[PDB]
Scaffold this active site. Sequence first.
Site, PDB file in Angstrom:
ATOM      1  N   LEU C  38       0.826  -1.195   0.000  1.00 42.57           N
ATOM      2  CA  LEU C  38       0.000   0.000   0.000  1.00 42.57           C
ATOM      3  C   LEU C  38       0.866   1.253   0.000  1.00 42.57           C
ATOM      4  CD1 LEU C  38      -2.680  -1.115   2.586  1.00 42.57           C
ATOM      5  CD2 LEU C  38      -2.866  -1.124   0.108  1.00 42.57           C
ATOM      6  N   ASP C  39       0.254   2.353  -0.410  1.00 39.12           N
ATOM      7  CA  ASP C  39       0.919   3.642  -0.496  1.00 39.12           C
ATOM      8  C   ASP C  39       0.913   4.350   0.846  1.00 39.12           C
ATOM      9  OD1 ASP C  39       0.862   6.561  -2.519  1.00 39.12           O
ATOM     10  OD2 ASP C  39       2.258   4.870  -2.684  1.00 39.12           O
TER      11      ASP C  39
END
Lengths: 547, 63, 84, 67, 119, 108, 79, 171, 170, 155
Positions: C38-39
Amino acid sequence: MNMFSSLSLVTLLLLTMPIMMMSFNTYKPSNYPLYVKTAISYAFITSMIPTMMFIHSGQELIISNWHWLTIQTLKLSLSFKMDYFSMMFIPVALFVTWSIMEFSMWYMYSDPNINKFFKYLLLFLITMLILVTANNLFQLFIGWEGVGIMSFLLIGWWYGRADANTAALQAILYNRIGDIGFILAMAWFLTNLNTWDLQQIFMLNPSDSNMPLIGLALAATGKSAQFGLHPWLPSAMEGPTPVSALLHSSTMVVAGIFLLIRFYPLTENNKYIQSITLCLGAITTLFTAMCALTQNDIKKIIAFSTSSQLGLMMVTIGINQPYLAFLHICTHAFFKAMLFMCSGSIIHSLNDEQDIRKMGGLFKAMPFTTTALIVGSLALTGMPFLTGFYSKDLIIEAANTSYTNAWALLMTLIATSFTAIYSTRIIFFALLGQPRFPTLVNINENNPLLINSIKRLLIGSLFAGYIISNNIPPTTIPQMTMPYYLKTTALIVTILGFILALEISNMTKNLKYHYPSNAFKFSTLLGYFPTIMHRLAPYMNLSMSQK
Amino acid sequence: DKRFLKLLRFYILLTGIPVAIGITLINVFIGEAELAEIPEGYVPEHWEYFKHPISRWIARTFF
Amino acid sequence: PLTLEGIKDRVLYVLKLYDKIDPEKLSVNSHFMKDLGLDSLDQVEIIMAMEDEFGFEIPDIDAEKLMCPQEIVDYIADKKDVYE
Amino acid sequence: AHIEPRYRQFPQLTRSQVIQAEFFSATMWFWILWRFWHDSDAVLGHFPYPDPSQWTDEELGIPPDDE
Amino acid sequence: GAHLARRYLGDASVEPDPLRMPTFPPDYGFPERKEREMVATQQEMNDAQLVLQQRDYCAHYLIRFLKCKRDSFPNFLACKHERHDWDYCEHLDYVKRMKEFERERRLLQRKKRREQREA
Amino acid sequence: PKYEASRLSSLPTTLDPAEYDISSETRKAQAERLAIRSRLKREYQLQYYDPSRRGVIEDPALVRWTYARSAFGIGPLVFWYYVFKTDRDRKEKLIQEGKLDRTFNISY
Amino acid sequence: KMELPDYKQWKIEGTPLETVQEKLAARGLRDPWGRNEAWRYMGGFANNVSFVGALLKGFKWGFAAFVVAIGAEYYLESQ
Amino acid sequence: YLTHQQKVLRLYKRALRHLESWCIHRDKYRYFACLLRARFDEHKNEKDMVKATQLLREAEEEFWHGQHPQPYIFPESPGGTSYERYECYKVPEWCLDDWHPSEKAMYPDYFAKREQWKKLRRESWEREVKQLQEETPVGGPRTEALPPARKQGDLPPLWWHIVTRPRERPM
Amino acid sequence: SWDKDVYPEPPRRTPAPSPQTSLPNPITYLTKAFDLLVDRPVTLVREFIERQHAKNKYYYYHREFRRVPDITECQEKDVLCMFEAEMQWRRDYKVDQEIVNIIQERLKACQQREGESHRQNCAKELEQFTQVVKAYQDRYHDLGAHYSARKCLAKQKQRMLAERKAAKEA
Amino acid sequence: ITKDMLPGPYPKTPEERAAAAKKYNMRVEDYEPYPDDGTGYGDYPKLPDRSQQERDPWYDWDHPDLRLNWGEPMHWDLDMYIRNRVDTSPTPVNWNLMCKHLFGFVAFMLFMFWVGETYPAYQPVGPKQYPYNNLYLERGGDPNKEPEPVVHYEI
Ligand SMILES: CCCCCCCCCCCCO[C@@H]1O[C@H](CO)[C@@H](O[C@H]2O[C@H](CO)[C@@H](O)[C@H](O)[C@H]2O)[C@H](O)[C@H]1O
Ligand SMILES: CCCCCCCCCCCCO[C@@H]1O[C@H](CO)[C@@H](O[C@H]2O[C@H](CO)[C@@H](O)[C@H](O)[C@H]2O)[C@H](O)[C@H]1O
Ligand SMILES: CCCCCCCCCCCCO[C@@H]1O[C@H](CO)[C@@H](O[C@H]2O[C@H](CO)[C@@H](O)[C@H](O)[C@H]2O)[C@H](O)[C@H]1O
Ligand SMILES: *C(=O)CCCCCCCCCCCCC
């Protein structure tokens, strides 16, 4: 006379007993709050007997029981005026306080200083009854400043919170500025008349009463939070919800109006003072109703609602209808107190959430709170035949047909439409729509203390206005002849307010971006008066004080 | 804090109760003097110009 | 009245309603950036979703450091004085 | 605790709260309708408002111009 | 009402001044005007302790209502007809004041017409 | 629309141009400021956490503040002198010609 | 101590969150948090009255009682 | 003081929260929140760091124009309506040392455990002070970060006022 | 109980009840309960107390101050005569304060008693209050905190000279 | 505490600046005295004129309610800038626009009230009529003086 006077005083003495027995004399800490609630309940009953005697024959008394001090040609006695205004207000105040105390037993249950809280609420009530029964200015001043100090102690209840202390000191500041006018009136009456007694003031009936009445108007401005000295009332929301219910209904805020009502024999003959109080009330009712249109804190909306209603009462004073202003005090106490208790019911069930943007979907989840809120909102907006209609509707007819300032009349009618809009706003964002609150659902209103306290005020907000208006003797000649467009103005502008509000509240669901206009920001930030004034004046005074 | 308030209560009531009882007993069984015209040729004592028995006693004993 | 297991269940629950996470790779120890990919923009939204879930704010300085569900559970348990 | 909290679901209600809420909402409407049926004048008007422009000159004592 | 648009926007010379009027003799255009009869006496209104603003030409109906309201206690609904007689009398009183305004208005218009005619 | 600061309304830190213009010199200054604060924090904590300490931890910064702090003019007096003198002259003159209304004034 | 409802119930289909997903799809975007909000539009919260419906709560029973009362009163008028 | 990344992420959260205050309704907020994310995803891979800073500066100016005058605040957050509400109820633990022995005798088990903690505090202090000395460069600390306990049996330096702090709802 | 001439009260006129209803008046049933529960036991206790006071009857008197020469008859700087005149003037000053208080209480009682008709029915009390306040003002107003019989006499002579001068002007 | 650690006179040479800056736990670049006028500040630092409300509320301050750290130099007017008193926080609306909008509103209202007084609303009715010579005796009129009667007629 012997039963009338004995029962009038036992009503007051009964209320000081729970304070007196706090000095270890069969004091049951077990349930002190229940003991204090029971005393209010019995005081209400004993106060109903003198009221019934007044309703019957119009019996009125002055009790000057104790001679306290004589300063040359000025006798000061403890004297009580058991008159029209005292006989009707005391039962209403005790009935509302009885419900607020029972509500507080549930709302403040976990507070470790529950006993001290009920002591302060009881002191708040005692000092207010000293105010309304006072027959001389010095005795009135005791109650006048007593309620102010109790507001400070209760607004700053959570004294570890800096904003609570700031709000509490703010209330003292603004009220003490009004008290300049109060002492001005006291100084003028002593010097020009030779008395502080209401009887001798009305008997001499001075004609050059501009100075004493300006002083009294200034005192009312601070205590009833009229424009100029108004910011403290919305800030008083720092206090626990039961404090706001008692502060905004049957105590403090209406003392300013009550003071001007008591001096109607003087204001009747001063058209200059009527003009000033009319204009002051009109700008107050319009300005604060505008602020309420954009508030998001449910307690702030109801606080600005009170200021707007207090402005309407001030308008009624300025049109020379002191008895209609008094009736609005009595009716307004029933549903304004109920609205605060409904808000506290919502706030409690959402774990102290007060922002209406985080409410919604409560219509079915809290059926009894919903019913009381709708009933309270309809009473406030003047729904025909509920408690609010029996004063507000008459006030609008009286203003419409009076020889009056036209701009003040207009500002008052617009504020009536605004009442419908911010009432719609609470109902729409709190009860309707979809739940916007957190996921762990703790909504629960099935507490007998909660239901019963709200229930008694719900019954009050339905029939109190009808019952009271059908028992009080007439003291004026009501204006009952007027064109259809003046007779129905209040109903029409209230309906247009609902129609307008529903359109705007339904626009919020559209998938369209929203930018803030200068007008929106003006309403949201309370016309900027607190921001400019509460930074400038403290800075100017503090900065010069050091140097 | 509670010890002080118990002591304050005890020492106020130590004499406050006897004084409260003493005042009631004096008021009930001795009563207040009744106003009368100075009978011709009679010279009242300075403490006879007051009404309450305690006030007369204060004047006679001390003043 | 929160409990450690109760907090853990709700933290994982909210992550199982996030479309960017596969609820088969999700354990209490999954690292939002190393294991779940995930970012940091995604992690901001996860923390906002926890703030909504429990109704209190996690300050930005503390929020950046919560990179697995267990770290979130520990933070919430420590804040609310939960000990079992 | 009579009412257990619920997660992401509509809360549990008691019969008493629903019945009482319905009783007083219906009481409000009965009162409104009952009052309007008897005191509709308080909303619409208690007396007719005259049309001053329909009053004759005789009944106001306005003499004819040429007099 | 519309009457305010006339005085403030139109011609005020032909509109009554509420503070000054009446500005015409009460008998002008009125051959033989009967006086208003007062039914209640000064002692009766004094003894009844009517508020001063209530001691008008309808006071006798108010005195009747106040007596009934006292004799029917606790029945606070038992004097509707008496309350209505007082209310109606005040309505008739108000209409009389509405006629006084209208009479003054037409007279001011009549005065205007003559001045033009004389001009 | 550009933000305009004032004495009683400071410029938001996010709108301040400086907060984006950062240099090695500015970072070095920030590091020195953090070192000063960390040294004071350690000195305070070693006393604050001491099990055997009972009393007040004297703060020289507080002492310096109160010592420094504990270390128009006649215009208002002149102005008020003429307000009250002018008012009392007028009132006195009226009393001597019987113009002032003191019908019931017997308390002073 | 508390059992959470199964997390697979929460679907955006049949709710206004579906409308939002359709509008974003036209722009090529997507909402990954939609199912987290779906409980607010389902089962118990799904239908709420309008503002008018809120005002007219209890009208049906209040009006039914009113009709009975004015029937009972008008009857006594004949008597 | 804050990296460029931390400023972009702090604006992202702040922008979303103010957007929530405007939209109110959750479906409306979800729609506009995704548009806002698409704006942050447009320049995610900006390499030129002069360009990126200019983008952040404009973003913050746009935020100031568009912010809510009365944004939502969590009740116990700073500026919230419950902020510091319970501070009056937090009594420091050292106050228990001054209890009258008759007050202490109502809670024998509690005050027995309290002695054990006080003992644990006293016996650990010297080692905590020594640890901080031998890990602190000459000139004092450069940051406020504290170390953990590195041996077994040692407690992390300066733990007392963290472990024994008052509860958030002390009554 | 008090001199009805000093504190007069007009004859009371309460109208006989004329109930035009059939519902009982709750205030009549509360009056009987009050008489039965509150008044009678209170009366019994008082009657016991008064019996004890009857057994022991003793008297107190109102002090009578003989008249002494006024300050007008005192020679300058004669403190012994000035002292007695000054003390007498102070006693009279205090008595005049209570005379104004009596007349003010008459006025206030009339206002409450006459109710809505007080503006017309309290004319006599207002007139008497107006005159006494004038006389009191002439004697004692504007003397200052260090007032004395000397300063009161000086004020009187200033007023007398003005009146004499105004009489000649007419 | 010693005289070297207490505030002193205004510093003249740069060496006194360095000693004063270290005394107040500041770096020499940040230290700046008040103007050497006649007030009597001495060498006490001039710090930013900001309220304590502007400081970060989430940091672990040694004084959370004052938002001050132990040993950190206190602003000269700290007691004026506590969170209970003067706030200087940024406002969403510019200060000058707030003032103009607020003053513009009050000025417009005061003007309209003046207009409303000069053109008052009223109903088309003549004066209210009272009997017995406009209640001459009830209003307190002199009974011995005969009043010039007022007469009201039917219409
Ligand atoms: C609160 C505690 C205070 C304690 C101090 C006060 C207690 C003292 C109480 C003494 C009161 C006695 O008061 C006294 O009563 C007796 C009753 O006959 C009176 O008695 C006197 O008068 C008449 C005739 O002269 C006769 O009663 C008797 O022949 C004579 O002795 C006194 O004139 C009076 O002064
Ligand atoms: C506020 C309380 C103050 C506490 C005072 C401390 C105690 C002081 C005691 C002084 C006693 C003086 O008393 C002394 O004898 C009596 C009373 O006793 C008084 O003398 C008077 O009383 C007697 C009593 O029979 C009478 O004959 C006559 O009235 C007179 O002689 C005088 O006052 C003084 O001569
Ligand atoms: C019951 C009805 C109540 C109606 C109240 C109407 C009166 C109150 C509103 C007065 C507003 C006056 O505003 C006055 O001019 C403009 C905006 O108008 C402001 O100045 C600025 O406003 C806006 C926004 O920046 C700009 O478009 C304008 O170019 C600029 O002049 C001034 O700072 C102010 O002096
Ligand atoms: C006609 O019957 C009079 C009553 C109608 C009220 C007028 C409405 C307000 C007028 C606003 C104009 C503002 C000028 C000051």
